[PDB]
Design a protein around this motif. Sequence first.
Motif, mmCIF file in Angstrom:
data_model
loop_
_atom_site.group_PDB
_atom_site.id
_atom_site.type_symbol
_atom_site.label_atom_id
_atom_site.label_comp_id
_atom_site.label_asym_id
_atom_site.label_seq_id
_atom_site.Cartn_x
_atom_site.Cartn_y
_atom_site.Cartn_z
ATOM 1 N N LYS A 1 6.755 -2.423 -2.408
ATOM 2 C CA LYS A 1 7.619 -3.537 -2.034
ATOM 3 C C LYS A 1 7.238 -4.814 -2.786
ATOM 4 C CE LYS A 1 6.806 -3.116 2.466
ATOM 5 N NZ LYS A 1 6.813 -3.388 3.907
ATOM 6 N N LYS B 1 6.590 2.665 -13.381
ATOM 7 C CA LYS B 1 7.908 2.258 -13.851
ATOM 8 C C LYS B 1 8.461 1.193 -12.909
ATOM 9 C CE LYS B 1 9.421 6.836 -15.600
ATOM 10 N NZ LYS B 1 10.484 7.841 -15.494
ATOM 11 N N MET C 1 -1.167 4.936 3.465
ATOM 12 C CA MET C 1 -1.133 3.896 2.445
ATOM 13 C C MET C 1 -2.128 4.194 1.325
ATOM 14 S SD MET C 1 -3.196 0.679 4.160
ATOM 15 C CE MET C 1 -1.904 0.268 5.335
ATOM 16 N N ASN D 1 -0.813 5.501 14.536
ATOM 17 C CA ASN D 1 -1.642 5.922 13.418
ATOM 18 C C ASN D 1 -1.644 4.818 12.365
ATOM 19 O OD1 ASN D 1 -2.174 8.646 14.428
ATOM 20 N ND2 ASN D 1 0.023 8.959 14.069
ATOM 21 N N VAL D 2 -2.710 4.785 11.554
ATOM 22 C CA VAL D 2 -2.788 3.900 10.401
ATOM 23 C C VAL D 2 -1.726 4.370 9.405
ATOM 24 C CG1 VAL D 2 -4.301 3.007 8.536
ATOM 25 C CG2 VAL D 2 -5.259 3.434 10.789
ATOM 26 N N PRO D 3 -0.985 3.472 8.702
ATOM 27 C CA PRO D 3 0.013 3.909 7.718
ATOM 28 C C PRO D 3 -0.583 4.786 6.617
ATOM 29 C CG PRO D 3 0.270 1.557 8.189
ATOM 30 C CD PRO D 3 -1.034 2.004 8.818
ATOM 31 N N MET E 1 -1.485 -2.654 -1.301
ATOM 32 C CA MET E 1 -1.292 -1.374 -0.643
ATOM 33 C C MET E 1 0.206 -1.102 -0.509
ATOM 34 S SD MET E 1 -4.359 -0.353 -0.266
ATOM 35 C CE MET E 1 -4.185 1.145 0.713
ATOM 36 N N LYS E 2 0.582 0.160 -0.739
ATOM 37 C CA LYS E 2 1.941 0.657 -0.592
ATOM 38 C C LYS E 2 1.863 1.947 0.216
ATOM 39 C CE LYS E 2 2.144 3.760 -4.505
ATOM 40 N NZ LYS E 2 0.720 4.110 -4.445
ATOM 41 N N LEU E 3 2.995 2.389 0.776
ATOM 42 C CA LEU E 3 3.084 3.717 1.364
ATOM 43 C C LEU E 3 3.105 4.737 0.230
ATOM 44 C CD1 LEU E 3 5.739 3.203 4.149
ATOM 45 C CD2 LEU E 3 3.266 3.299 4.457
ATOM 46 N N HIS F 1 4.193 7.757 -1.923
ATOM 47 C CA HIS F 1 5.503 8.309 -2.246
ATOM 48 C C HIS F 1 6.642 7.305 -2.066
ATOM 49 C CE1 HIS F 1 4.067 12.436 -2.916
ATOM 50 N NE2 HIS F 1 3.102 12.020 -2.136
ATOM 51 N N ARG F 2 6.333 6.016 -1.865
ATOM 52 C CA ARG F 2 7.344 4.979 -1.745
ATOM 53 C C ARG F 2 7.168 3.998 -2.895
ATOM 54 N NH1 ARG F 2 6.282 8.481 2.554
ATOM 55 N NH2 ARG F 2 7.880 8.184 4.160
ATOM 56 N N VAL F 3 8.268 3.317 -3.237
ATOM 57 C CA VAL F 3 8.252 2.193 -4.155
ATOM 58 C C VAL F 3 7.380 1.104 -3.527
ATOM 59 C CG1 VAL F 3 9.684 0.448 -5.351
ATOM 60 C CG2 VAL F 3 10.569 2.759 -5.052
ATOM 61 N N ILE G 1 11.173 -0.511 -10.922
ATOM 62 C CA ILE G 1 12.433 -0.122 -10.303
ATOM 63 C C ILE G 1 13.174 -1.409 -9.904
ATOM 64 C CG2 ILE G 1 13.496 1.310 -8.487
ATOM 65 C CD1 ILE G 1 11.665 2.822 -10.618
#
Lengths: 110, 53, 118, 119
Positions: free
Chosen positions: B43, B51, B26, B22-24, B35-37, B39-41, B53
């Motif tokens: 990278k 905020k 994102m 599947n496509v991430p 692009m990020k996942l 619910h994830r910080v 981190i």
Amino acid sequence: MQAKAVARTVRIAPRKARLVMDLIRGKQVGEAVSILNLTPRAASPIIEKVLKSAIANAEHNYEMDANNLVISQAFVDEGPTLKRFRPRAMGRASQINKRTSHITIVVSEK
Amino acid sequence: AVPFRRTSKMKKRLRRTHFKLNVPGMTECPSCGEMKLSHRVCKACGSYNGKDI
Amino acid sequence: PRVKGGTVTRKRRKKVLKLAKGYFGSKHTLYKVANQQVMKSGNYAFRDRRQKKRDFRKLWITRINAAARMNGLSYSRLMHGLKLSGIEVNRKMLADLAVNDLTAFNQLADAAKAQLNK
Amino acid sequence: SYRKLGRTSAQRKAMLRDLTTDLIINERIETTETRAKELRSVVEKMITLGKRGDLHARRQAAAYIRNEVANEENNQDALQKLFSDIATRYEERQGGYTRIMKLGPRRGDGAPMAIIELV
RNA sequence: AACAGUGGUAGGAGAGCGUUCUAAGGGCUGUGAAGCCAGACCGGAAGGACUGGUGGAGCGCUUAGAAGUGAGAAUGCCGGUAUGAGUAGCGAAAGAGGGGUGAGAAUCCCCUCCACCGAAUGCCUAAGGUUUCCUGAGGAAGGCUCGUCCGCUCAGGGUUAGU
RNA sequence: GACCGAUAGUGAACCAGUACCGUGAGGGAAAGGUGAAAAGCACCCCGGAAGGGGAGUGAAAGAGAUCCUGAAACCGUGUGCC
RNA sequence: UUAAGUUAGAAAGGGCGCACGGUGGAUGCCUUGGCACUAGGAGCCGAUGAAGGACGGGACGAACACCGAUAUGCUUCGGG
Ligand SMILES: [K+]
Ligand SMILES: [K+]
Ligand SMILES: [K+]
Ligand SMILES: [K+]
Ligand SMILES: [K+]
Ligand SMILES: [K+]
Ligand SMILES: [K+]
Ligand SMILES: [Mg+2]
Ligand SMILES: [Mg+2]
Ligand SMILES: [Mg+2]
Ligand SMILES: [Mg+2]
Ligand SMILES: [Mg+2]
Ligand SMILES: [Mg+2]
Ligand SMILES: [Mg+2]
Ligand SMILES: [Mg+2]
Ligand SMILES: [Mg+2]
Ligand SMILES: [Mg+2]
Ligand SMILES: [Mg+2]
Ligand SMILES: [Mg+2]
Ligand SMILES: [Mg+2]
Ligand SMILES: [Mg+2]
Ligand SMILES: [Mg+2]
Ligand SMILES: [Mg+2]
Ligand SMILES: [Mg+2]
Ligand SMILES: [Mg+2]
Ligand SMILES: [Mg+2]
Ligand SMILES: [Mg+2]
Ligand SMILES: [Mg+2]
Ligand SMILES: [Mg+2]
Ligand SMILES: [Mg+2]
Ligand SMILES: [Mg+2]
Ligand SMILES: [Mg+2]
Ligand SMILES: [Mg+2]
Ligand SMILES: [Mg+2]
Ligand SMILES: [Zn+2]
């Protein structure tokens, strides 16, 4: 106009590289780089380097705008197999195919 | 138990219909725009929910 | 002198494979199974050139029977009546009229009825 | 229910105690998401003992916390930090002393990682 | 021309196709030979041309001659590659976090605590191995994962006896 | 030489009675071809490298190093009809 | 609008064809090496230490070939 890159004889099995390639085929190059970055697979970093190499070829060699690029072709061909043998029980050996991949990306302007 | 007959190319391909990534999940990072996942910080810039981190 | 296997084998096998174009999966790809299927195709083609003549006659009779019954005759009586009248128009042609020129067919059917009603 | 984390009863307890002390000392550790989720309840229960402050609460914490140096300069143990600095920081807060933030999968095993930190 | 005939295993008989080599004659070929790939062409069959692509130096044709002369089966031999299948497996065992290094770190280094062996999982020393030892550098392959690491690779070094 | 031409011909066209196997006697492989000439790809670009895209050399680089030709199995990408 | 009827189109994937590649090393061409012979030569070497080896020898690692502490060669006579 088109710009190509190939990584020949990369030590990853073709089937495993193709899983990741199927995600990016047809996509805009920016979106493709994002997918590869966030796809947790061994093939992702390898395919990313071929994609970025093709984009760099497009900019440098052919004078193509990198923001307008799309992946026009993307495929994995089988490289030459490294044949190995695993000792099994009862003094029998069983072959292990350490397969390699040729990874091609072609980028073209939309 | 062993294969009575070899599997045809067709049947192998039919079996692999669902053997697919599947496509991430994102989304665009509101801080840096990479692009990020979800619910994830992120990278790239290290931000989450506006905020650092 | 030594004779190598050479090119003759490849040439022969490749011709069989070209005859197997369109066959399913390994039957267009692999020599052994392509060969068997081309051979089988020969037996079937020979048989079916014969069956073709049976199947078309069967089709014409069915159509003549349908047209005859629109004129109040069965096929059996129509053909008897045509034979008595000495009309030698074959089933292909009668079925052609039945589809294409039904008024012409009806005249032949009327000619048959004339002999039957004697 | 509670997670087993692929470990025996004793191994899991030992790991949760290690992680609990690690979070008290560092105030912020990176671990697997599922480890972090189990650690929340264990650490927050230790902070509750710290906030109580009494000798009985300290001895209960001493049964769980590892004998490790929190601050080498002051010669402060992890147990002492829990009852001094952590308990003071969360005097007015009623629960929810930790937060988990997801990082995404690490390379070697695709394991979903997380930061867990004191709020 | 007429008349008649033409299913066929074992098997007898006949006529042919194609392969390599030789002789003689006559040709083709860098203005592209053989081979290879493709095609909707030709012959009653075996088979044979033509056109285009690839190829880059040899090769047909005619008549006769000579045979390592034709493969689909031998649980044939050798090679390659499938299928099963992203399946079984990854070989007894406690790790966790922090810091470091690096293109990259669950896996390498350091630290802390934890855990395991302890008539051994410690220390010494045979046989056997033969440089595997140490230092620096390396990461293709080997390591059942990874790898910056290693009993692996490359350099250089290291074994001192009157008892 | 109407002998072989790299599965042939010696087991061995190549560092072969080697490697490997066996306590030993002994068994015993696989593996030829860049180009006329190295003129063996300066330089630039992506990449840690590998590998690639240009550029250059060459008659040819899809002759770029198990580099003449490059069949088939097998693996893929695209899509006309279903 | 309602009712009854009819028929398209769809592709997760797949089939056939076609195009383009990969793998692989068949085929053709080639020959460094073989095979069978013919003619002639020669048919023995060794305690004056053989055959066959081991270890060594170079400005340069290993290996081959060559050589033997006079070691990648020495003298001499001829050739060139
Ligand atoms: K040709
Ligand atoms: K067979
Ligand atoms: K004991
Ligand atoms: K190292
Ligand atoms: K041999
Ligand atoms: K297709
Ligand atoms: K479809
Ligand atoms: Mg054993
Ligand atoms: Mg020959
Ligand atoms: Mg043959
Ligand atoms: Mg009949
Ligand atoms: Mg216990
Ligand atoms: Mg700790
Ligand atoms: Mg007969
Ligand atoms: Mg008959
Ligand atoms: Mg006979
Ligand atoms: Mg020939
Ligand atoms: Mg031609
Ligand atoms: Mg034969
Ligand atoms: Mg699975
Ligand atoms: Mg299964
Ligand atoms: Mg299962
Ligand atoms: Mg399993
Ligand atoms: Mg293990
Ligand atoms: Mg114990
Ligand atoms: Mg060491
Ligand atoms: Mg590995
Ligand atoms: Mg050959
Ligand atoms: Mg041989
Ligand atoms: Mg031995
Ligand atoms: Mg070519
Ligand atoms: Mg040539
Ligand atoms: Mg080639
Ligand atoms: Mg004597
Ligand atoms: Zn961001």
